[model samples]
Target: MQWSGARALEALLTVAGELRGPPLQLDTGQLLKIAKRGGVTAVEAVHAWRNALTGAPLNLTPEQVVAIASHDGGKQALETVQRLLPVLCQAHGLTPQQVVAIASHDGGKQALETVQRLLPVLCQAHGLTPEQVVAIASHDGGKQALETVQALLPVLCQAHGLTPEQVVAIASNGGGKQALETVQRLLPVLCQAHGLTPQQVVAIASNGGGKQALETVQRLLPVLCQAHGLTPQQVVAIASRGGKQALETVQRLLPVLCQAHGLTPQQVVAIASNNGGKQALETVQRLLPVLCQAHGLTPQQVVAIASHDGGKQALETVQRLLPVLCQAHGLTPQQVVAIASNNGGKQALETVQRLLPVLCQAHGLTPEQVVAIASNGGGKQALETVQRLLPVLCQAHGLTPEQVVAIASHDGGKQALETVQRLLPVLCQAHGLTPQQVVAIASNGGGRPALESIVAQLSRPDPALAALTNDHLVALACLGGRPALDAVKKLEHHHH
Candidate 1:
């Protein structure tokens, strides 16, 4: 007998609740089994299940049922649809556009339209051109949108004029074969459009091709194997016969060509030695004997090299070469110290200190010049040496304790205070203070008095005297003094 309309509706509700409840698992195989047991076809069972769950009649066609099953499911259902869309679309003979439209509609027409517009802009932001965006959108139809967006390799290469290998690199989202095919088809057009040289074109082709491309590259680019003036063949031996060879050839050729037009070795080295390598070291080593035959290196140069390179061997080598370098080339002691400390050794702190005076004396460098080089060029060790030497610098140069504190504080370390501690007695004597006055300055107000006196001495009017006094005070402050904020404030006001 026929059931009442209300009874049918209640039965549908019961089935719907059961399908949506705990232990509710459904798949195509399960649906087909249920259909067989229920005396209905698989399609009919699917239609019945859809109708029951959604409170719709089973009048919708099979294609409509497939779309509803694939698209009309809620957010959770849409996730399932995304997984099965390609299969379902293929089964139902739906195009990518149709599949997108159906799923997009389920999400919301407005949202889907907005996303469609933004997709092109988002792709463009990632360096894809407008044509590439259109090509990707048309070709992939937003199914697996990220993958589809990446597949527009030809369009991107055409727009940018990149080689096949470059285009493949740009398009690759891990699908190697497809990416390679896209690049191979597009690279020749890109090269012709960009007016790439035959050599450059061949290089690009070699990178994209198999063994054949590699063979072609080896035949075309041979200059990569040559040796030149400062650089030995061993260094350039690794340059491959394709892309790398082109870059190596230019680097090797440009220097000799420049030199042939009347450039000196020094000028050539300056131009060629953007970053000096082992070749430059060898050249300098070879030239040392021609520059000096006697009185090669001083004690300071030895110390500097030893301290800088962090090895006794570095010191000995510089010492051995010093007389030859100085005698033959008239190279100064300071220049030798710079080479040894700044360029030669492990660049340790103690080495820089040992070498500084020698370098200064030989080069006749001003105090400022010496300080600048030591502070900036000496590396980690040089900086530490500068920190240790602040007090000595002050005493030797005649600077005050407070000024020394300021400079040392800027440099970062306790060496400034240590220097001040060591120099306080000497500073007190220079100021002609009695022992009691010296003690008061050194110990009173928790050592503030000593720091204050130093600051006062440094702020004197005579430039030479001020520089000298300030240097001494700075030395004292670096040795033992704390930075007196009040004194620092007073100096600031005096300067103003």
Candidate 2:
């Protein structure tokens, strides 16, 4: 009524004829008044036109009536669309192109309704762009998330260097939706004081309970950096796991441990990131210096050894025996580190030390190769297997010492080597397989069964099977080699 709802209704009817006649509730007299002369509202005319098309006194079709009379159906519905659309456009900050796009869109009805109420403040007041609006809408709980963004958007943007993109990303980050206030308060501090970028801020605040993590990092990062000389990155790492308490524990003890035992901030982070790393650090604080100076170990070496459960105890035990072991048996710090790094390597180290001379001098195995055999599962047992068999395989069985080491390094390689020791001369030579081929078969966990399967395949008497080399036959056995052998033979045929 205020702005020609009837006129807008007429325009809508002109575009789509089906949108009329349902809401008017005109009387018979009102309907018939226009029957003779056609002087009435467009709604009455459309009703009359519909009646005329449906066997009224006037004999005309809907098209003929549309040509003659104005048909403004459902003016009430038209009024709502007219009133809200301009407001929607104004609030949306849409260009004419954007408006056209919305009107033509299949989803425009719902998109318009969902955003119409919020876009006024979201766009005009807080300067949210359509791009950002769509991004927020794509997130979970988008409507609620928009409210949070609206509350925080201006405050975040007014800060020295935060961009609207970063702000929108953080708010829509799922975790940042709830943590936005805490992010708002601490983000500037994190950036200005600790050199956190907006992206880092988002990452730190990207996970669940990230708000709490942010607060904890902000509170302790200064003390960590100033007193203990930890970088913000390291501090963030410590804060990431066990936030306040983790940072405080490192703050309380790390400086002295670092200075006394040469622990890097990274090493401190490594030790702190583990579950019982605090206890390890505590034990390291007590024992690390002794291990370093007495045994000539670096703090990095000690921390790597100490970063696991029972690692501190390994250091202590290794501390006592490591000196005697390395000095008497010629073990390097690197070898000892490798031995200690394995789960049961402390015992392996002692065994390796005693065997080091025998393995090195008698059998010509390097301390490194000996350590590899000892460090694998069946720790002490793996070493003894190598020690007893290395001589037999090399002297009598014809495997190189290096070849024996290769076979022994795999988890099942010990049994594989023993299988080769039994089979190489008898079954394998019948197939004309070389030591390298035997090693390949055995090292791939293809001991007796794999060898037999190959023997069966090779014995099949097929011409293609007969043509493969012992090397290709081994490939046919280890990998799914039927196709492989076919490709090889097909290529072999072509080359000839």
Candidate 3:
């Protein structure tokens, strides 16, 4: 019904005639079967699917007809999509398939005129490219995003001084148009309530759509900075590091973690900043609080670690094993928590899941000792990575399992263990300094103190820090590059 002229005639004839692809590619059998059992008229089914798809193949496949008699869904839902397809295709150059793909969801379509009327307004107003406009419009949330952008562009542009290009950039990634709408909703909340500047808002919006993040920022804001004692700058720094989903996760988890596990917000932010930016922060949210309730972490010391990164995945990993760890492996909740927080990673937690019991049974260690080992920095790294290294510290380096465990258990020990594992063999072969001293510095974590820590020596020998030449020392130091190993070739003199 929506089609007209040659195309309309083509659609009808395909139902009656013998043609394929030309007169709307449906065959007689598929058309005859339409609502053969029940629901809307077969003709109605043909028209509905035909209108929705827009391209040919219109006589209707049994599947497409079922999808149509599938009716309140087809007409009730697809009408807005059907009406909008022409404008989307003719005006925006979108393919009929892409338009159809975006049209229906959960049995409904959004308002179309809302976007059609404002599309050009946005083009001239924001100086948007046609490609950018199409990209925005056809996104799953394009209609809402465009309509919301139209409403906010005046304010976001005139009052906030956001450049059109920056707005376009924000609208393009991750959440697509929906994210821009979310940004619009939260802009004032981010600045007035949370102490962020409009420029800061723009800077943040430029990354990963960040809708969930913006919503979470609205949720936490002033309280996180003021009540929890994080500097507003630190809070922004967290968002800057993690992007929106990461920030959203932090906002959701930080308070609960602080209250339940007695962690300070400062520690929470530090834990977040230490790992894989957004993925790291997200992992912390999943790991920290759950570990608190389930594991041995003190109301005093709940924390998070990762085997890998990302919020959802590691969250799921530890969640699945949380039961098995206690039920089958015979570890207490507290032990699991301590071990997880030991390295502040889900990767650590997953490693514990695999190796904790084996380390206990085969190696003859107390589960308690294993927890403490994982709880300590190096031990945590040791547990997570010991598998990968396959216990080389004992066999190759001639350290006992307990001794290797001890080396892996301290504050920066994971990175220390990783470094020693990597650098020890070569450095020891060359007799570089004292191997124990290298272990000491890396394990204790040379230089700097604060919860604002994510590093303890190198995961590998960073050429930047190990710059043996020392030429880049002062310069690298200026850029925050101090490290566990530093020397200037002994200055060609030895007092010893």
Candidate 4:
């Protein structure tokens, strides 16, 4: 019944050739099909074939072999092989050391079975550990197992008064559809034992069921909405309850809730923003613009909403509405600056500055605040203004010398010379700028560093600035454009 390594190799090769067409294409699936036709189980056949190809005997200990046999067989065989393992190793020219190493290394059926049996005690018993066992027992899979254990819960509420939260925790751990099935099977009995109201049972099932769960909540919607401190508006904002439908329901019920509780739009937004409702970006988009208009939101408030969720489109939308916002609502330049500068809006520097002085006088921005706004916004123009006005503004604003330096470093003027110098201190103090980040910002103007320095001083630093360095300067000069050098010399003179 035992096949030697040489015989096994020949048989496997013959099988492999037969499974492939006459020309031979030994793909994994085709090879597996051939192995399955042999008497061996899939795991055993693969291991045996590998050992045959490598000219090695099966690297399994007797205890492992017994474990494999007893997996679908019995404990008696396991005991028998545990006794025979040392003898088999010695007979097969395997040292105790080699056997131990193989026992740990080989993922054969015997090894897997042995590990499975020994898992509860292995950490304490052996220096050699099975990583797969540890992974399965301690991680997500372990939680899944615990969930499955909970699904089979007994139906004695008085004896074992498991609350709905406890049941939910168990079901959550069970990990997936199978765990859900386990919960579905046991829940009715548990519900009956506990004498749980239909609503409570519905709540438990609603959490577990997919679409049905939503329907279940919908039936009890009025009660759930009105459970005091549980406004219809709050429930609708929860993204998970049901996406569009949940929002629609809350919207329908909102007027009634407001009338009953005298709730305001501000209170509603606060509730919606909490409890994962904020993640429903589309919902915020639909609600915020109208809400903003109704409440006469300042340009800064509009910008805050746009910056949080709107992306480029939101910014552009806010820009289009800015005139209306200023004329109708008297939005100040300070508010506009807050909107543009909030959330690292340096990219929109030129647009903000262009609109500032006109918007400031119209909206009543203080001269100091206006200067601070121009300086702090970040761009070539902004940095130059900050540098030129630093002594004056610092004195006016009561900013320290160190704070001024910090502000300059953050601004880091557009010119390659200024940028490199400014960033050097920042790079030293932070100890964090990567080589790529440094190189990217340094050569921002075209390869003509002098031309770049002049333009950088005039214009603001932006993606276009970086593109000039990367595409125009670096790409053209490397490809031997002599005119580039001449341009650099001319720009150097202009800078001087």
Output the number of the TM-score-best candidate: 3
Candidate 4: worst-modelled 10 consecutive residues by lDDT: 69-78
Q: Which candidate is the best by lDDT?
A: 2
Question: Which candidate, 3 or 4, would have the higher lDDT against the true structure?
Answer: 3
Deviation (Å) of 325 in candidate 3: 10
Give a tens-digit lDDT track for model 4, residues 34-109.
3443223432433433322222344443333322322222222223234433553553333433333323221222
Measured against the true structure, the TM-scores of the candidates, in listed sequence, are: 0.20, 0.38, 0.41, 0.21
Clashes of each: 50, 1, 23, 4
Once model 1 is optimally superposed onto the true structure by TM-score, how far is the C-alpha of residue 451 displaced, in angstroms? 27
- In order, the Cα lDDT scores of the candidates are 0.39, 0.61, 0.54, 0.39
Residue 161 accuracy (lDDT) in model 2: 61
lDDT of each residue in 211-282, candidate 1, tens digit only:
232232233234322433333222222211222333343345445534543333333333222122223323
**Residue-wise lDDT of candidate 3 within 383-473, one digit each (tens)?**
6565555357767876555555555566665555666666556544543434454344334443122111112223243333343332233
- Which pairs of residues have clashing backbones in candidate 2? 20-73
> What stretches of model 4 exceed 4 Å from their correct place?
1-219, 222-257, 260-496
Q: For candidate 3, give the lDDT of residue 330.
A: 87
Better of 3 and 4 by TM-score: 3
Clashes of 4: 4
Question: Runs in model 2 with CA error above 4 Å?
Answer: 1-262, 272-279, 308-310, 357-372, 375-379, 409-432, 440-496
The better-scoring model by lDDT among 2 and 4 is 2
